[PDB]
Assembly symmetry: D2
Homo-oligomer: 381 residues x 4
């Protein structure tokens, strides 16, 4: 009766990413946060075990992992290092427009370099004046012969400066219809007129570089176009339907690491002559953390299976999975700090970092407010 569980192959994958995460990523997580530096040790360990971008098709040299397998990878990394989990999460985000909409030529150019780990991808959608409202974006792409000229800026770009390739959405007709006047382009780190802003100083995922992209008359070839002129925002929304699920998986892993840590601690710490775990108020808090986490996990996996099949109700299930898991991770990490007492408030234990990291999952890949808008729309239509 093989219902409502991952395959044996999924559980073998879980065990393999967990070994890489616990051995090679976990020891660097505190230093990555504390120095706000790219998790380079994690990148090398993930590249060596083909966990840096596992979703890429076997035809491009990739692992060809299904959406659920890719979720389990992001979850198991996020359990020890949220910054590291963004390597496969943002590699999928930046590549998904090519995978969903790109010509065979565009895919053949870029996906093999992702698969081999020679390049990371970033995704440039958000702006200073258009964050949630991406249809109002002002970055523009203008034909000049066979070339495109890009002018404007993207805000908040994960892995900027480390990524070699940038999937960028820009307005291709300022007079075209709202939502259907945008196109997607692959931009290279050394394209002319392309600079980075100063790294953002963040609450959490501090090792993950977060930087503005500045486009000053960036001239790129005509073959950088991903999909059809004007269909870029449709491609971006379709991308979001898959990638929101992976942030739900990230939220689940962060919450799981915090719960793992809190459970180990309250079994050992003694006060008033017994283990903290022996206090029934503590037992109720642990049961709440575990029940909500497990509900969030199963909902992420249901949305992941929907992502793999492209189920017609993926928008609802993905928006629900991402909003629920991030809300639950925020609550669980706030309680994991609580359960360690004073120790929990110090950077000598990892639970305060896990709480600071959990907060991003409620904001990026669609704010939980936008997620509630999307859910209500899917219910009422």
């Amino acid at each position: 009766f093989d219902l409502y569980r991952p395959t044996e192959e999924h559980e073998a994958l879980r065990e393999a990413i967990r070994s890489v995460a616990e051995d090679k990523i976990a020891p660097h997580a505190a230093d990555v946060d504390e120095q706000s530096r790219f998790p380079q040790e994690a990148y090398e360990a993930l590249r060596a075990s083909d966990f840096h971008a596992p979703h890429v098709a076997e035809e491009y040299g990739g692992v060809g992992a299904d959406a659920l397998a890719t979720c389990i990878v992001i979850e198991e990394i996020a359990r020890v290092c949220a910054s590291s989990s963004l390597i496969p999460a943002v590699n999928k985000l930046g590549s998904m427009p090519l995978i969903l909409s790109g010509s065979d030529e565009v895919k053949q150019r870029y996906l093999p370099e992702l698969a081999s780990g020679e390049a990371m991808f970033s995704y440039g959608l958000s702006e200073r004046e258009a964050g949630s409202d991406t249809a109002s974006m002002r970055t523009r792409a203008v034909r000049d012969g066979d070339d495109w000229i890009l002018n404007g800026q993207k805000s908040w770009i994960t892995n900027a400066g480390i990524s070699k390739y940038y999937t960028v959405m820009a307005v291709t007709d300022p007079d075209g219809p709202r939502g259907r006047n945008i196109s997607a382009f692959v931009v290279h780190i050394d394209d002319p007129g392309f600079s980075f802003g100063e790294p953002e100083r963040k609450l959490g995922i501090k090792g993950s570089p977060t930087r503005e992209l500045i486009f000053d008359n960036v001239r790129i070839p005509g073959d950088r176009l991903v999909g059809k002129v004007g269909e870029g925002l449709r491609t971006a929304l379709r991308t979001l339907d898959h990638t929101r699920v992976t942030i739900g998986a990230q939220a689940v892993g962060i919450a799981q690491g915090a719960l793992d840590y809190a459970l180990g601690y309250v079994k050992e710490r003694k006060q008033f002559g017994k283990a903290i775990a022996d206090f029934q108020g503590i037992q109720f808090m642990l049961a709440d953390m575990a029940m909500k986490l497990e509900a969030a996990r199963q909902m992420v996996y249901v949305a992941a299976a929907k992502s793999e099949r492209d189920d017609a109700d993926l928008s609802f299930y993905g928006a629900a999975a991402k909003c629920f898991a991030s809300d639950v991770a925020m609550e669980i990490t706030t309680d994991a700090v609580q359960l360690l007492g004073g120790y929990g408030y110090t950077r000598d234990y990892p639970v305060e970092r896990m709480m600071r990291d959990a907060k991003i999952t409620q904001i990026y890949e669609g704010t939980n407010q936008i997620q509630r808008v999307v859910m209500a729309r899917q219910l009422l239509k």
Copy 2:
């Protein structure tokens, strides 16, 4: 990619129980509550379509439905009538000790009558002084030759007076070890010295009879014994591991009926010149209801698949599924009343009944407090 969803056969089953529920059960639900009367129309409709006790093995004339199929049945009935949903839920509860522990003879005597719908089963575990603490039960069974003499009382017995057979747990050795001095027996409605208390006057599931069992020197044959002398409470705990999942399914169905009703209403009701559904605060409430309901549903189905396979972590997953779903149903039904305004507070709409019914799911089949104890124990061991 057939992961994390019910089978096509499960969805055909869902459609068939939903037709019986909407056509034959739903029209009587208000009158069943209002007159506090047994849902007789629902019993006949369920018996005619073999949905009254679908878990019974095909070898006993039963449907042989898996634990997930049985959950979907209880859910789809509970969506229109919570009292009616207790026909298959309590038929499973009362029969499960026979199915888990009974001799071939005991099973052959009782299960065919359940399968055909000639008899309903009840489960007599709780008492006046031993509710949560069932190991402290005082009802006693004493050998008299080949017979057993039962003395005491059971409290809160669902379907009492309607059920023909009562699976009753009693102390078989007041000096034996705590938890291992109890045995299970099948008691018949016409066994001598066996009476019923006055029906309880309840907040909700008002059509479901709830009555004390009084045992005054009840003499029954030796072959009424279910399993081994002293193993009755082990059988009762094992039963609970499966049946808690079905109350989670009941909670999911009640919440789904309330959400279905609230969604239909806020699309039609207009205030300040627009549909109530057009207010973003309302949209956020609907998204919260739907997200939490969907998380509770997937968690119930994960626990149901664990029940079918007898997964070693069934205790955790069942306790989590039942506690989560009932907590979520309490919150959703309280908001469904809210969303109808004044109308919601009147018995002319069904959402106030759905709120009164939701509250029982937090109490029976282990209080949500006992569920948190069980969850914490499974985490810490």
Copy 3:
């Protein structure tokens, strides 16, 4: 240091209403709910001790109680019988438009009969198509010589059929400006063309009659006019600023009765060899109930003192006090049922009635959704 507490006189008043409530009201509360009948024993006890309408000025034969004293009265009654608490709460609601806007003649006609207890007042604002949106009300009043002719209907009217006088708001100019085309009138139970609908069948406050008013060409004298033609809705909003505070006080009293009952019970009930009160998970639930209740109480009293002084921020504080207290009462009463287990779900204990009653406090005197709208408006302006 006499800061942040009621006066000694307030505490003497509290003790006096508590005696009347515990001796004369509490014994009838269950029967009042169970038979859905007016709390006549409570009315007579309240009239005999001048607690039926204590806010009326001493110049009209009244007690002249301040807004805080009147809150304490409603709270102490609502602790034992929510239906009874609506006698002074709705007596204030129906009289407040006369007190805020009425001529000396109108006040002199009606307030002495309220003060003596010869008449109760009702308030007719809501309609079938205009509940939250009262500015869209369709009930009309048309001059005919010195008379007014009323046509339409009011929905949900508390104490209808028992009250002698009805303060009714009606459109006095269907072409006048939105919100400034409505007037208030005193309607008598025996005015011609005036009938009542069938009593609503409610979730709770079942003894409180709730009935439609039907106006079929109701001819009333010109001197029935309360305040100025067109200022009726301004008077209604001003009324709401004071009366919302009294529903917050009602919510506090219902929650207090449920907590009083739960605390007494968990000290006595034993399971697993100790008092339920000895379980730390239970202690945490009790601390949550008590802390939230006490916060809600102090906020109601702060809003009551604002009501007495007519502080410029009364809208915010009243809306906050009513929304907070009713939300907290819903949560506390749902947990009070929980803490009694099975007993809590039966009508033999009062906590299920207290939960059914608590739910109305979130809906009437402005839904908690309208309260959040009002709060946000006061913050942002």
Copy 4:
């Protein structure tokens, strides 16, 4: 009608501390957090306006501010800089044992230096193995002639290394009765054998030094004794009854600063062509923040008035006020980050610091779990 509000004098005080806070403290708050450095600019501004230790009696050169005035001071500072708010909060904590239990001589020695601002006080109660369980503390004080010899360690000491005087509790008889074998002593920064641990690396209140005290055969005179030998822990518990209220006030101020910031931002930020404040889901979030904050504020002020009068129910009201306000501040600051979107997650806005700071209020001055224990005990006795 002067009920349920601060005095005119309190509101003049509020305006005066708010000017010092907005002009002199607020500009340094970000740099204080970012460099984890003592808020020296705030200390000088507070000392110059007599807001560094306002509770000290006029007989010692102090302001003599009542407990409510002192709460308003801590609140108004905590609104702009939580680290700065600990100057008057910890000055009261460390001095309160002298004020409650000290001889006239001890008070005359130390309180004038606090009043003038020549010295800050710290409080040394907690240890590595005795945090919540202070009766199990192991730091010892041993008579040697007229001297005392202190040996052990205190953990988590706020303002350590900056404070000149340390009120330290130590075991004076390892064989005396539990809770009645502890005494309080004033320790000087230059007492022999007295060192500090390395500053803790914290989630928030990063400018507030937090350091272990190490006592290696610390010899101090007999006149350092505060109160009676063996009554130190009674003095510590009594201190906590007053000081918990001031952490509730701190939590209120942090939440108020976050709400002030979020409200200003959502009025200005536009998305989808309107102000964020114009979205009703946002309006509901703002109403929730404001209602809960206002309930927490009024409850803190009720507990403060109880602290001033020494009301017999101060334990309950203080524990409730501190637990409620800190829980509410955690929720409000987490939502204030949310409402700024990406900006909220960056250290360029202050709301992420306010969230990191809010988390300490749930842990120190008795964890919210200990607060629920204390509340339950006061309810059940």
